[PDB]
Amino acid sequence: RTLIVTTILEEPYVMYRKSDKPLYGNDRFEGYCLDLLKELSNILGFLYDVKLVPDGKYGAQNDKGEWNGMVKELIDHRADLAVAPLTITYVREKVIDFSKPFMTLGISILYRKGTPIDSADDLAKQTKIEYGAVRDGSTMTFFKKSKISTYEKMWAFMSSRQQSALVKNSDEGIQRVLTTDYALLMESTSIEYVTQRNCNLTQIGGLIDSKGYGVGTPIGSPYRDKITIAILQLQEEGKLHMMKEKWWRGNGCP
Amino acid sequence: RTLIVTTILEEPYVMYRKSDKPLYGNDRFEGYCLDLLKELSNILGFLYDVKLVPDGKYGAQNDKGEWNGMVKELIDHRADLAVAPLTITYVREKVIDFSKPFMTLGISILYRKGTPIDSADDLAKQTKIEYGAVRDGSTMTFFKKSKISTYEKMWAFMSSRQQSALVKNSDEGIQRVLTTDYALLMESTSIEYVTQRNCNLTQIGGLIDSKGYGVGTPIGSPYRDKITIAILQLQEEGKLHMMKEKWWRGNGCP
Ligand SMILES: C=C(C)[C@H]1CN[C@H](C(=O)O)[C@H]1CC(=O)O
Ligand SMILES: C=C(C)[C@H]1CN[C@H](C(=O)O)[C@H]1CC(=O)O
Numbered sequence: 305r306t307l308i309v310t311t312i313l314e315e316p317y318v319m320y321r322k323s324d325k326p327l328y329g330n331d332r333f334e335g336y337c338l339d340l341l342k343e344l345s346n347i348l349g350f351l352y353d354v355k356l357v358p359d360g361k362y363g364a365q366n367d368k369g370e371w372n373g374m375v376k377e378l379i380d381h382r383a384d385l386a387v388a389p390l391t392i393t394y395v396r397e398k399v400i401d402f403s404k405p406f407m408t409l410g411i412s413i414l415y416r417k418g419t420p421i422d423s424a425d426d427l428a429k430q431t432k433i434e435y436g437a438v439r440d441g442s443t444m445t446f447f448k449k450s451k452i453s454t455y456e457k458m459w460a461f462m463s464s465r466q467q468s469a470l471v472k473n474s475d476e477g478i479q480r481v482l483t484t485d486y487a488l489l490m491e492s493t494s495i496e497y498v499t500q501r502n503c504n505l506t507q508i509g510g511l512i513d514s515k516g517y518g519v520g521t522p523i524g525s526p527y528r529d530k531i532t533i534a535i536l537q538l539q540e541e542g543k544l545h546m547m548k549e550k551w552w553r554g555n556g557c558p
Numbered sequence: 559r560t561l562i563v564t565t566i567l568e569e570p571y572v573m574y575r576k577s578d579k580p581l582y583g584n585d586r587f588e589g590y591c592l593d594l595l596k597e598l599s600n601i602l603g604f605l606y607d608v609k610l611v612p613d614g615k616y617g618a619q620n621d622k623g624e625w626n627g628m629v630k631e632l633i634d635h636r637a638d639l640a641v642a643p644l645t646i647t648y649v650r651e652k653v654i655d656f657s658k659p660f661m662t663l664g665i666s667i668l669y670r671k672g673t674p675i676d677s678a679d680d681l682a683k684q685t686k687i688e689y690g691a692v693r694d695g696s697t698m699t700f701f702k703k704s705k706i707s708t709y710e711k712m713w714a715f716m717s718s719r720q721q722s723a724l725v726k727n728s729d730e731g732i733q734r735v736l737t738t739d740y741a742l743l744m745e746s747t748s749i750e751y752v753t754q755r756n757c758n759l760t761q762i763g764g765l766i767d768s769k770g771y772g773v774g775t776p777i778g779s780p781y782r783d784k785i786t787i788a789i790l791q792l793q794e795e796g797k798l799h800m801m802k803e804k805w806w807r808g809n810g811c812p
């Protein structure tokens with residue numbers, strides 16, 4: 305009846321609220337994922353306790369196949385749900401359950417406006433403009449695993465020189481795009497958020513692939529199917545679209 | 559044991575193959591969904607028999623609350639899987655299990671080229687151009703249930719005059735668009751297929767909602783999650799993308 309929820313700070317999904325005094329408990333947070341959790345809890349009738357994931361990671365596997373991050377929290381039954389922009393992937397689905405997606409997206413490219421670059425193949429065929437992705441995220445894993453020649457070429461480039469083209473987190477990637485001649489391979493929903501707020505950046509090309517974010521649960525959880533039904537309800541009533549517009553829309557671009 | 563797969567003829571998902579002699583068994587069929595089934599068969603290691611759904615319906619509930627179509631075939635355990643452009647909806651997910659989506663799409667508008675109509679609100683604020691949907695499909699249901707004012711208005715129009723603006727199937731809708739002053743509310747992936755083949759037709763506006771097609775299984779089926787993992791594998795390898803290109807590409811229209 306009180307669910308323990310693992311999450312991670314990531315704009316505009318989960319952010320610290322602004323207050324004149326110190327904040328405690330669920331009141332520390334706002335964002336799209338908090339709104340989602342409120343809606344799910346209303347539909348399904350549960351209380352919840354939001355806990356930042358202690359290692360600050362989403363969930364990836366090492367060499368020994370051991371997991372970290374929110375994925376490992378679910379595997380170890382230290383949380384009932386993970387509510388975050390947690391990409392639904394083949395490797396994660398083998399070890400946890402996800403609801404159906406509450407948002408659909410794809411990898412694309414964040415770069416500057418008004419350049420000759422139109423596609424990933426435009427990046428793949430040159431070496432002057434650097435490009436990469438968040439290290440150990442689902443986008444990086446996409447490239448590492450791809451057998452498409454263009455994407456193999458890109459992976460060879462990203463992984464060269466001790467992964468100097470990769471970044472630790474999205475904000476580092478964004479600053480690298482704004483300052484240097486660098487393109488970031490980034491989930492398209494994050495790109496939309498960014499380009500609403502940085503009028504000199506743009507998405508280049510379309511989506512390279514198609515995937516979703518889902519609510520994570522331990523394998524076998526009874527909540528996964530209940531949360532899926534609740535998500536479908538919210539989408540069909542237009543609520544998920546309204547929640548996206550609320551958190552994404554910026555102050556406009558000239 | 560060989561799995562029974564329920565499906566329905568719908569271009570370019572499931573179509574009768576062309577041959578000079580009578581065809582039998584799985585050899586009767588080709589199309590995107592047959593390709594998908596072959597790939598799922600090869601990942602998961604099952605044999606399968608494809609069976610057309612006897613009532614030729616996808617799955618809707620009547621006034622008594624009784625289901626029909628492929629949804630009912632699963633409910634009654636007369637099929638193990640349904641592989642078709644079967645829309646993942648709140649009402650259906652209550653009664654069957656769907657894999658995660660193999661295709662994402664949304665409702666949009668099919669109409670003639672060259673007109674000043676640009677959106678669903680352009681339709682809704684007028685009476686001269688007729689518009690509708692396939693009766694008892696998930697698109698009609700979206701309009702029937704919507705509490706958004708524009709879609710409420712459009713539903714009043716569609717349901718008027720004993721639903722004369724509605725059509726029994728997509729081909730009837732397409733011919734009505736081609737011949738009369740009529741717009742069809744249709745799933746975007748089917749709009750994409752139709753406009754690559756009839757050059758006088760176009761999509762009007764973008765996608766009014768977001769949803770997916772998934773493989774249906776009876777509640778409780780062990781195949782549901784195994785099929786989800788296989789779909790994620792196929793997506794991440796670029797196979798689903800290649801299969802869509804194979805079946806959608808038209809070579810005749812500007
Ligand atoms: C914000 C980041 C590190 C997360 C968000 N979804 C992806 C994941 O769930 O792995 C990561 C982004 C990416 O890999 O581009
Ligand atoms: C071809 C039709 C009758 C199917 C395809 N998906 C929807 C379904 O699964 O309900 C229907 C289309 C629609 O309602 O626009």
Ligand SMILES: [Cl-]
Pocket residue numbers: 354355356357
């Ligand atoms: Cl915390």
Ligand SMILES: [Cl-]
Pocket residue numbers: 402403404532656657658786
């Ligand atoms: Cl699922």
Ligand SMILES: [Cl-]
Pocket residue numbers: 576577578
């Ligand atoms: Cl033949």
Ligand SMILES: [Cl-]
Pocket residue numbers: 608609610
């Ligand atoms: Cl048959």
Ligand SMILES: [Rb+]
Pocket residue numbers: 323324325326
């Ligand atoms: Rb403060």
Ligand SMILES: [Rb+]
Pocket residue numbers: 397398399400401402523783
């Ligand atoms: Rb799973």
Ligand SMILES: [Rb+]
Pocket residue numbers: 451452453456
């Ligand atoms: Rb290759």
Ligand SMILES: [Rb+]
Pocket residue numbers: 482483
């Ligand atoms: Rb700059």
Ligand SMILES: [Rb+]
Pocket residue numbers: 529651652653654655656777
């Ligand atoms: Rb279900």
Ligand SMILES: [Rb+]
Pocket residue numbers: 672673674675676
């Ligand atoms: Rb138009």
